[PDB]
Design an enzyme around this catalytic site. Structure first.
Site, PDB file in Angstrom:
ATOM      1  N   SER A  65      -2.252   9.136 -49.222  1.00  0.00           N
ATOM      2  CA  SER A  65      -3.048   8.158 -49.057  1.00  0.00           C
ATOM      3  C   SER A  65      -2.456   6.779 -49.724  1.00  0.00           C
ATOM      4  CB  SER A  65      -3.608   9.118 -50.041  1.00  0.00           C
ATOM      5  OG  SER A  65      -5.233   7.823 -50.791  1.00  0.00           O
ATOM      6  N   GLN A  83      -6.009   0.304  -7.741  1.00  0.00           N
ATOM      7  CA  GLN A  83      -4.232  -0.231  -8.920  1.00  0.00           C
ATOM      8  C   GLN A  83      -4.947   0.438  -9.727  1.00  0.00           C
ATOM      9  OE1 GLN A  83      -3.869  -3.802  -8.553  1.00  0.00           O
ATOM     10  NE2 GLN A  83      -3.907  -4.231 -10.504  1.00  0.00           N
ATOM     11  N   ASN A 141       0.170  -1.513   0.186  1.00  0.00           N
ATOM     12  CA  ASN A 141      -0.205  -0.423   0.312  1.00  0.00           C
ATOM     13  C   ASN A 141       0.671   1.082   0.037  1.00  0.00           C
ATOM     14  OD1 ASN A 141      -2.184  -2.009   0.316  1.00  0.00           O
ATOM     15  ND2 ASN A 141      -2.769  -1.512   2.702  1.00  0.00           N
ATOM     16  N   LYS A 158      -1.788  13.285 -52.693  1.00  0.00           N
ATOM     17  CA  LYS A 158      -2.604  13.886 -50.884  1.00  0.00           C
ATOM     18  C   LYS A 158      -1.488  14.007 -49.434  1.00  0.00           C
ATOM     19  CE  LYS A 158      -6.300  13.870 -48.604  1.00  0.00           C
ATOM     20  NZ  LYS A 158      -6.830  13.554 -47.130  1.00  0.00           N
ATOM     21  N   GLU A 172      -3.870  16.098 -36.934  1.00  0.00           N
ATOM     22  CA  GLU A 172      -5.260  15.312 -36.578  1.00  0.00           C
ATOM     23  C   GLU A 172      -4.893  14.816 -35.082  1.00  0.00           C
ATOM     24  OE1 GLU A 172      -5.171  14.151 -40.363  1.00  0.00           O
ATOM     25  OE2 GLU A 172      -7.080  15.156 -40.228  1.00  0.00           O
ATOM     26  N   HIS A 215     -15.036  33.227 -34.133  1.00  0.00           N
ATOM     27  CA  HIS A 215     -16.359  32.165 -34.779  1.00  0.00           C
ATOM     28  C   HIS A 215     -15.570  32.169 -36.357  1.00  0.00           C
ATOM     29  CE1 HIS A 215     -19.362  34.422 -31.969  1.00  0.00           C
ATOM     30  NE2 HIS A 215     -18.383  34.899 -32.001  1.00  0.00           N
TER      31      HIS A 215
HETATM   32  N1  LIG Z   1      -4.385   7.836 -42.833  1.00  0.00           N
HETATM   33  C1  LIG Z   1      -5.689   7.309 -43.653  1.00  0.00           C
HETATM   34  N2  LIG Z   1      -6.436   6.372 -43.844  1.00  0.00           N
HETATM   35  C2  LIG Z   1      -7.042   5.683 -42.553  1.00  0.00           C
HETATM   36  C3  LIG Z   1      -5.508   4.894 -42.240  1.00  0.00           C
HETATM   37  C4  LIG Z   1      -6.318   3.659 -40.408  1.00  0.00           C
HETATM   38  C5  LIG Z   1      -6.400   4.560 -39.296  1.00  0.00           C
HETATM   39  N3  LIG Z   1      -5.034   3.780 -39.192  1.00  0.00           N
HETATM   40  C6  LIG Z   1      -6.814   3.663 -38.342  1.00  0.00           C
HETATM   41  O1  LIG Z   1      -6.896   2.891 -37.626  1.00  0.00           O
HETATM   42  O2  LIG Z   1      -7.576   4.534 -38.107  1.00  0.00           O
HETATM   43  N4  LIG Z   1      -6.017   8.326 -45.077  1.00  0.00           N
HETATM   44  C7  LIG Z   1      -6.182   8.540 -46.081  1.00  0.00           C
HETATM   45  C8  LIG Z   1      -6.232   7.508 -47.582  1.00  0.00           C
HETATM   46  C9  LIG Z   1      -5.794   6.391 -47.352  1.00  0.00           C
HETATM   47  O3  LIG Z   1      -4.406   6.221 -46.565  1.00  0.00           O
HETATM   48  O4  LIG Z   1      -6.725   5.866 -47.133  1.00  0.00           O
HETATM   49  C10 LIG Z   1      -7.083   9.662 -46.457  1.00  0.00           C
HETATM   50  O5  LIG Z   1      -6.094  10.627 -46.606  1.00  0.00           O
HETATM   51  O6  LIG Z   1      -8.237  10.037 -47.033  1.00  0.00           O
HETATM   52  N1  LIG Z   2     -20.195  37.966 -29.764  1.00  0.00           N
HETATM   53  C1  LIG Z   2     -18.993  37.598 -29.811  1.00  0.00           C
HETATM   54  N2  LIG Z   2     -19.197  37.252 -28.250  1.00  0.00           N
HETATM   55  C2  LIG Z   2     -19.545  36.246 -27.267  1.00  0.00           C
HETATM   56  C3  LIG Z   2     -20.319  36.925 -25.939  1.00  0.00           C
HETATM   57  C4  LIG Z   2     -20.360  36.449 -24.605  1.00  0.00           C
HETATM   58  C5  LIG Z   2     -20.969  35.303 -25.025  1.00  0.00           C
HETATM   59  N3  LIG Z   2     -22.607  35.529 -24.548  1.00  0.00           N
HETATM   60  C6  LIG Z   2     -20.481  34.391 -24.267  1.00  0.00           C
HETATM   61  O1  LIG Z   2     -20.903  33.619 -22.887  1.00  0.00           O
HETATM   62  O2  LIG Z   2     -19.546  33.507 -24.342  1.00  0.00           O
HETATM   63  N4  LIG Z   2     -17.643  37.744 -30.056  1.00  0.00           N
HETATM   64  C7  LIG Z   2     -17.496  38.793 -31.028  1.00  0.00           C
HETATM   65  C8  LIG Z   2     -18.855  39.601 -31.272  1.00  0.00           C
HETATM   66  C9  LIG Z   2     -18.683  41.291 -30.476  1.00  0.00           C
HETATM   67  O3  LIG Z   2     -18.454  41.284 -29.667  1.00  0.00           O
HETATM   68  O4  LIG Z   2     -20.101  41.353 -29.801  1.00  0.00           O
HETATM   69  C10 LIG Z   2     -17.328  38.200 -32.093  1.00  0.00           C
HETATM   70  O5  LIG Z   2     -15.958  38.037 -32.110  1.00  0.00           O
HETATM   71  O6  LIG Z   2     -18.419  38.564 -33.260  1.00  0.00           O
HETATM   72  N1  LIG Z   3      -2.886  -6.070  -1.549  1.00  0.00           N
HETATM   73  C1  LIG Z   3      -3.015  -4.662  -1.539  1.00  0.00           C
HETATM   74  N2  LIG Z   3      -2.373  -3.514  -1.736  1.00  0.00           N
HETATM   75  C2  LIG Z   3      -1.876  -4.290  -3.340  1.00  0.00           C
HETATM   76  C3  LIG Z   3      -1.312  -2.442  -4.047  1.00  0.00           C
HETATM   77  C4  LIG Z   3      -0.405  -2.435  -4.943  1.00  0.00           C
HETATM   78  C5  LIG Z   3      -1.901  -2.777  -6.063  1.00  0.00           C
HETATM   79  N3  LIG Z   3      -1.209  -2.616  -7.257  1.00  0.00           N
HETATM   80  C6  LIG Z   3      -2.368  -1.790  -6.502  1.00  0.00           C
HETATM   81  O1  LIG Z   3      -1.467  -0.412  -6.938  1.00  0.00           O
HETATM   82  O2  LIG Z   3      -3.247  -1.209  -5.938  1.00  0.00           O
HETATM   83  N4  LIG Z   3      -3.261  -4.298  -0.018  1.00  0.00           N
HETATM   84  C7  LIG Z   3      -3.303  -4.315   0.741  1.00  0.00           C
HETATM   85  C8  LIG Z   3      -2.542  -5.952   1.410  1.00  0.00           C
HETATM   86  C9  LIG Z   3      -0.700  -6.022   1.609  1.00  0.00           C
HETATM   87  O3  LIG Z   3      -0.119  -4.729   2.627  1.00  0.00           O
HETATM   88  O4  LIG Z   3       0.032  -6.527   0.599  1.00  0.00           O
HETATM   89  C10 LIG Z   3      -4.246  -4.991   2.399  1.00  0.00           C
HETATM   90  O5  LIG Z   3      -5.109  -4.333   2.993  1.00  0.00           O
HETATM   91  O6  LIG Z   3      -5.287  -6.359   2.131  1.00  0.00           O
END
Ligand SMILES: N/C(=N\CCC[C@H](N)C(=O)O)N[C@H](CC(=O)O)C(=O)O
Ligand SMILES: N/C(=N\CCC[C@H](N)C(=O)O)N[C@H](CC(=O)O)C(=O)O
Ligand SMILES: N/C(=N\CCC[C@H](N)C(=O)O)N[C@H](CC(=O)O)C(=O)O
Ligand SMILES: NC(=[NH2+])NCCC[C@H](N)C(=O)O
Ligand SMILES: O=C(O)/C=C/C(=O)O
Lengths: 452, 454, 416, 418
Positions: free
Chosen positions: B266, B311, B99, B272, B279, B145
């Site tokens: 791509s 844990q 612990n 691309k 991202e 905005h």
């Molecule tokens: N990165 C990529 N596609 C998805 C990869 C899948 C990724 N490893 C995942 O696990 O989501 N790029 C596409 C093109 C592609 O590689 O198919 C694009 O730019 O539109």
């Molecule tokens: N409208 C605006 N901000 C929001 C006012 C406060 C809003 N109720 C909030 O809680 O965020 N921004 C300006 C316009 C302005 O100054 O009123 C812009 O950048 O276009």
């Molecule tokens: N076992 C135990 N804690 C484990 C700590 C390690 C664990 N991987 C964690 O990180 O929680 N607590 C005690 C037993 C002991 O002192 O080993 C108990 O009060 O029963």
């Protein structure tokens, strides 16, 4: 504006609580404009007097938002224009935007709110501290995995919930320093061409400094996320204390009896710990407000986006909950009666003193592993006879280890167990007394850091 | 113990990273037990020697977990016993528990981990500042905005992603003060009957203090939850920079050109050139917000003191750290690698009539009340728009009709370069202020860095 | 690519688990390309045989990803190309993207996963219903606010944890419909100009249908999100059972006695016996809500169509599934192995005058408006509550039985 | 009760929206008590008449809660005891708890709530569908990573936001089945000694079935967590539309121009037209994600059966629903109001050499292997037309998509009406 759009954009139902801050800001903003030479004295004093009037009529509920007001800012300009002319009234939006205005007001609101929250946290600390002080000697079964583990002082368990809350106070203090930076002066995003003074109005409104980046000052809401974190961590800590109290109030435990003024019944003869349960369930709620606000701040392109309006309601809902919760929990904790006879009879149950026997053997020179082994043979020796470890015969003591001798009996009480543990942070009353003083000083030290 | 039980309880696949910490801690506690009279010098130096040996076999990969092993804690004691026998190695258990052992190992681990995280934040801050420095004059339309509002310096926009990341370093420094309290000497929960010294071992292990409450030191995980917040916040601040880069990288914007070495192609589209780093960072900000929420949920309603639930504190924090360890240098590199098309940003900077504000503020300087300068600006915008020209090309008659107060000297403020320069107050987009802002970022980073070394 | 980009872009370390699905789909795609006149039989069979070799070697541990492989897809094309040559190996890639592909492999994986989770969920239900059947008449204090409220049958309390899980099982059936739509053949986002066939490949890979929109089928990750919620909900259902076990096991309650093989001990307090399974279940439900929240944040504000962001769909769903895969059988084992202390429960059942309500409800049956010996026993009291879903033994045996029939009905629909 | 305890316990500020439902059920509960011979006819009518008077005073708003009413349940008992006197109003209390009532009421409330939410979703699909219809042939550059990937029909892009929303509708139907189970007569937790009839009152109150376990029905809140998920998924779905719109509206894109009535501007920048609706959609997905995650955290580790914690089920769900009820009509509106600049989109469609894939795909049909491959279809019109399989961007395909959407929408609308 269309129907649907007004309904969505309308914010006066939550942001009205900014009104007073908006007026104090506007008042100091009047001075900045006049000092930059953009208002005559008399234009200055016209606005000063329109504003004081409007602060009056707001405070007593005479001015309020219309249905046709989008937000606190638009409504207070309706009321200021009503009071002084539209010409004079409108001068006041020079060199500021709704963007720097809202950020700032939200900061001033929140800097007060953490102090209100801070007040409540100290209540609960003081309430726990009090109870621990009134039970300097009551022994319970200390728990890990909710199983009896070792005997501890009720006071030591109890203060273990004060210590986290103080850390939360420490966090409020850490937060408030980042909180104290003013965006007044940044306008929409880039600053003003007009000749304002961001540092002066920052001094007026009571911030420590003005921002170093207008874009950053209007866009960032990390201060709100951090507040939201701090409020969630407080509620979670109350949830730990609530769990304890709830389980302690059970018929089976019987550690505490609940007071009627701080408990609740049913539509028959039940005394429930509603306050503790509501603290617990609400901790979930305030985790939501935090998680949701981060999600909202995520992937925000600079600078200000209307998205950012969503910063307030989560923080507001978090601060309200704790404003209900802390006084309740402090009350509930203060109102608890402890069944000390019930706690002590259990303290040794489960042969918790087994570890004192093993540590005794270490002090005679037995390797821990073998002492641990010996402790267990003794727990079974005792268990099978319905007896306590202290009551094992010398002979059956001799059978477990030759190293085991009658003098080991002199450490198989719960009183001696608690007392042996007098290193820093241990449950011996001497240490709990010093611990209790430290809490006193940390509480006070932290309180003063907030007053500044 | 059943396979199911044993398969669930097994924590060596994540917790093996704490092994150096464990071995180091056992070195300090070997010394504590000695000083309290519970080891001869023989036994002391036998443990020290066996921990040293074990330490080297772990470091290089000769000693590692077996399937038999429940935790790293079980693992190291197996191989310690192997090195020095069952009598002497089993003595190490005295006065301590898993612990306290584990709370203090994860703390130790974490203090290093934010230090590494901090180095990576510093990088990204360093890449933002460097590009800001290299493009001190590039003007762009600043957005709100995601609509063009007033002209700003790219530098100004860039450095706005630095200040949040410096606030997160601040948050790291704050976190570490709370992280620096040792739980050693708390044992299972109550402290120990043996005569240990928690202050000593606290000092030995780099901590600032020993804990004031054993029950709390062993049960509380608020530091862990806080860690997760700082990481979450760092990942969200990265997400903001990410969104911009992604937007800027579009054909439509054409603000930046991505480098080949910092972009991916791509698998069916030949030409691309994607901003995958930005991202992935955006994506992993959701992820790291989850690990924080999940962590706080796990901490919810824990009755004191330790429970096996705790844990679950390590994995989400490990994950958040590993993701920041990947993400930070990648984004620093991404930022550093970018090319800014300053001509593209500039041609757009005045577009949609962003200088309107400047026009209206100019009237305010002549004593025109803002709401009236506003309406005159709006009127000036349409006057130019229908003719498809700049505010500047409003003729003297055109300007005079919009407002008697509006004379042709207004025309020498209706430039993106003047606009930008006029904002000379603290915070503004004027270059003198960005130059100072850039110094502050420099000093603040140094200051923040030096307090992490202490 | 920079070192840092390669370290960041690389996903082989977790997506390797999709490798066998990738091969089954490459086989099906081979047929889609072939049928569209874009492969000879010689080429087709060359590819099928290369895909078969690779697949056998992938399951062997003979073939694995390498440091410089960015993902499962790159890794597997490398190995196909070693086996069948760079020329013939080039052809599969036509008409298909990592986008449509990865989305589809993940659906196929997610659909086996949820069944594995369904098996484990049923086991806990079964463990719960076994214990009920083995304590058909035992009476305990019924709790609200963890306060003694009314007496109930232990079987009633225990089955009150089964229904939540039956409802989670219901969710898995629902999920699976939305799940069984194939993105195969949507390519990057638009579809392929090559004469492919989504419907045929969909049908080949065990899907109910092909997607109606190429942009949507490659971008959308709400199926992933729904899975995370259902798993998160299962974990919380588990966590409520966990809380009752933990408290039940305290010295103070002594409702149950943990079995040696399903509890663990303490390194220093010899004699401890902790409900670590229940406690880990409870803690992990936190982790898994966290997985959900985080997945939703990843999906939020995602412009169409595919973004690299949507690679974060996988790891959180993978972790949730792994955790439930450990937790489910452990908790079922914990539940099968409890010993219930029936007598200790019967002592407390009347404790706190829980029978007051039974007295007051006797006043009502004899005229008087709701103010305030045949039912001042815990046996009589529980037997009075014989409407539907109440604690009467009559109804518990019918309920226990309905549980059996619901369980099997939900089992039927997963095999379909 | 201490001031603190009462402050905290008070529910009337949010649970008062359950009042109509509370009343409707007390009506159906007077019948249940009567059919078991625990009420007379003159009593039964006294109550029904009392539960009628109180329903009108609530409706027009003359009866609300006092500061001292803990909750909507107390408040309504006080108002009933005022109308029919203390002795009669007390009988109605028998065989029911605050526990089973609140469970039931919340479900009734929620089933109404998801129906209202579903209507807004249909509005948002309708909006999207309308804009496809109006831009049947417009071509834009299709994006992946917000990089121009391949040309597609604007219609194909727009409708890709519709299927998600339709699937969320599907989740609502699926949800509704689990929601439609009544806990009434399960009591505090154990069921009732009195001869009530759960199956009958369930039917009175529009449920499909009574609950199989009294501990479960009163303590479980998974139904609420499902609803929160569905709302949060809808909001996330909307934010993805919202992001598109915000990015499209930028000067740089020029894809859409915003409408004035579905637009908001600046107090200090005259030219400004902002996408505030879109942006609030986006921000509020974060918020609804919060309410789901928090609710689940609240439900975590609850020992059986009812606990006060479970009071926290309502406010986050009330909020989520509240927000979608403001955001669905506003988004449908935003979408319907929009001006698509088709010329601008068409210029960009081949920009970035997006027609390279088409190039490679042509020389594939010339036998060349893809992986090495990297004028009939070197036009965007030819490019989109070629992608003619199910799901593709080919014109005749989108048209079939778009009619399937209308049918699936009405099919899903039918199922909510059962
Ligand atoms: N990165 C990529 N596609 C998805 C990869 C899948 C990724 N490893 C995942 O696990 O989501 N790029 C596409 C093109 C592609 O590689 O198919 C694009 O730019 O539109
Ligand atoms: N409208 C605006 N901000 C929001 C006012 C406060 C809003 N109720 C909030 O809680 O965020 N921004 C300006 C316009 C302005 O100054 O009123 C812009 O950048 O276009
Ligand atoms: N076992 C135990 N804690 C484990 C700590 C390690 C664990 N991987 C964690 O990180 O929680 N607590 C005690 C037993 C002991 O002192 O080993 C108990 O009060 O029963
Ligand atoms: N035992 C009780 N106090 N139950 C009250 C049920 C109503 C409660 N305010 C809730 O919404 O959950
Ligand atoms: O007042 C009720 O109906 C329930 C109360 C309880 O369960 O304690």
């Amino acid at each position: 504006p269309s129907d649907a759009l007004a309904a969505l954009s309308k914010s006066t139902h939550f942001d009205w609580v900014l009104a007073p801050y908006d007026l104090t800001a506007s008042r100091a903003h009047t001075m900045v404009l006049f000092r930059a030479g953009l208002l005559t004295e008399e234009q200055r004093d016209g606005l000063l007097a329109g504003l004081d009037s409007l602060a009056q009529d707001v405070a007593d509920g005479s001015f309020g938002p219309l249905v046709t007001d989008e937000d606190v800012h638009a409504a207070l300009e309706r009321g200021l224009i009503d009071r002084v002319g539209p010409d004079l009234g409108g001068r006041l939006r020079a060199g500021r935007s709704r963007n720097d205005q809202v950020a700032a007001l939200f900061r001033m609101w929140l800097r007060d709110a953490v102090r209100r929250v801070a007040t409540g946290v100290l209540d609960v600390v003081g309430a726990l501290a009090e109870q621990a002080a009134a039970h300097p000697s009551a022994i319970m079964p200390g728990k890990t995995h909710l199983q009896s583990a070792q005997p501890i002082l009720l006071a030591h368990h109890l203060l273990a919930h004060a210590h986290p809350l103080l850390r939360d106070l420490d966090r409020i203090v850490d937060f408030d320093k980042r909180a104290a930076v003013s965006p007044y002066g940044s306008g929409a995003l880039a600053g003003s061409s007009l000749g304002l003074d961001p540092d002066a109005i920052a001094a007026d409104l009571g911030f420590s400094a003005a921002a170093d980046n207008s874009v950053d000052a209007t866009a960032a809401r990390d201060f709100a996320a951090e507040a939201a974190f701090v409020f969630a961590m407080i509620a979670v800590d109350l949830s730990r204390l609530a769990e304890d109290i709830i389980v302690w109030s059970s018929t089976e435990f019987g550690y505490v009896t609940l007071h009627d003024s701080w408990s609740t019944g049913s539509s028959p003869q039940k005394k429930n710990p509603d306050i503790a349960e509501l603290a617990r369930g609400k901790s979930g709620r305030l985790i939501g407000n935090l998680a949701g606000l981060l999600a909202t701040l995520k992937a925000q392109p600079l600078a200000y986006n209307r998205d950012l309006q969503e910063d307030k309601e989560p923080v507001f809902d978090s601060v309200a909950q704790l404003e209900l919760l802390l006084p309740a929990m402090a009350g509930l904790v203060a109102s608890l009666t402890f069944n000390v006879q019930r706690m002590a009879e259990l303290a040794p149950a489960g042969y918790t003193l087994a570890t004192d026997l093993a540590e005794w053997l270490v002090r005679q020179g037995v390797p821990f592993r073998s002492a641990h082994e010996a402790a267990g043979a003794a727990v079974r020796a005792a268990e099978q006879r319905g007896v306590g470890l202290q009551e094992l015969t010398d002979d059956e003591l001799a059978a477990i280890s030759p190293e085991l001798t009658p003098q080991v009996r002199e450490v198989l009480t719960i009183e001696g167990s608690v007392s042996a543990r007098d290193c820093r942070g241990g449950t011996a009353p001497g240490r709990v007394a010093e611990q209790l003083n430290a809490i006193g000083e940390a509480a006070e030290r932290l309180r003063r850091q907030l007053v500044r």
